[PDB]
Design a protein around this ligand. Structure first.
Ligand SMILES: Nc1nc2c(ncn2[C@@H]2O[C@H](COP(=O)(O)OP(=O)(O)O)[C@@H](OP(=O)(O)O)[C@H]2O)c(=O)[nH]1
Ligand SMILES: Nc1nc2c(ncn2[C@@H]2O[C@H](COP(=O)(O)OP(=O)(O)O)[C@@H](OP(=O)(O)O)[C@H]2O)c(=O)[nH]1
Ligand SMILES: [Mg+2]
Ligand SMILES: [Mg+2]
Lengths: 167, 171
């Protein structure tokens, strides 16, 4: 199964991915790449289609993140409706979309390095809209209430069930 | 005089500003605001024009950074050639434009230590290049300092020297 982790920064995405990989033994792959989106739609889509054709992997940031940041950065290709829906229909039977987030203030506090770097409110709103428009069943966790460890365990427990395996 | 600090991130801009302010006793004001940039050109120009009326203050990032970041973010207003030219003429007799930079390697290092992980090499390069180009094309005389070999103390001292030497400069 494809475990897709989406969401704004500082929301335990990489840590979750790490825990899930150590347990499920699924390789971790970065999906939504900046420079990739700037290389054009064709390369963008072909990349997602390559991953979409795979299974038993953990994708840190994927199609939904592209729809978010494409509205923020210039020269940042975005997937067309056709492309998005094409990929969803191809992974619908094997994907698990996990949305990780936190309150705008919780994230802000998490990036205490310089008030200038801080935007976040606008990104969260976009994720919500994008996720709310997803054509796949999704699972969301408020990283502000649940720990990265409890989230990983839930996802691991879940995957083990569908695979009809014990714990 | 009006001190303007420009340049990419982690180049001692805010530190220099704080040191210059302690000495010269000039208030410190951030010029380029991400929120203001997304509120439209009219709002953008209006704000820059008001700052252009100020004097004896330090502007941490101004019209030049606007030109840089407008080419990187969407729904991010940019000054027009005419407006930029208008602001320059308006403060040419009191402005001191400072450009603080550093090699890409140095910048990337400061980002790592600052805590980033997502070191966007290519992005950082394009931004650094934009700054050089926009600064070279500045309609106002500019002073540059390679923060890779010059400390914020040494820089502030140099700038303090220039402000003092001003009542000796003509034309
Ligand atoms: N409070 C808490 N934080 C956790 C937990 N799991 C991971 N984190 C921390 O939160 C930070 C962002 O983790 P990461 O998953 O890379 O964020 P991301 O969603 O942007 O990818 C990390 O901190 P650092 O970069 O500062 O080390 C990681 O250690 C957890 O259960 N609780
Ligand atoms: N090596 C050195 N570093 C200096 C010197 N001056 C300022 N710095 C450091 O470099 C960091 C970025 O400085 P700052 O002026 O905030 O950068 P900016 O231009 O993005 O505003 C700071 O570190 P922190 O945020 O980590 O504290 C500041 O302390 C100096 O002469 N030498
Ligand atoms: Mg991550
Ligand atoms: Mg600063």
């Amino acid at each position: 199964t494809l475990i897709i982790l989406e969401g704004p920064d500082c929301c335990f995405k990489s840590t979750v991915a790490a825990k899930l990989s150590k347990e499920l033994k699924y390789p971790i792959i970065k999906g939504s790449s900046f420079e990739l989106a700037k290389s054009g739609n064709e390369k963008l889509f072909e990349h997602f289609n390559k991953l979409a054709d795979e299974d038993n992997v953990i994708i840190d940031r994927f199609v939904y993140s592209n729809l978010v940041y494409a509205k923020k950065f210039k020269d940042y290709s975005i997937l067309t409706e056709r492309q998005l829906r094409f990929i969803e229909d191809k992974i619908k039977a094997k994907a698990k979309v996990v949305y990780l987030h936190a309150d705008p203030s919780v994230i802000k506090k998490r990036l205490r390095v310089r008030g200038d770097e801080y935007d976040i409110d606008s990104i969260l709103e976009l994720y919500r809209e994008v996720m709310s428009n997803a054509g796949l069943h999704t699972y969301s966790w408020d990283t502000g209430q649940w720990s990265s460890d409890e989230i990983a365990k839930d996802i691991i427990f879940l995957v083990e069930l569908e695979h009809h395996h014990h714990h």
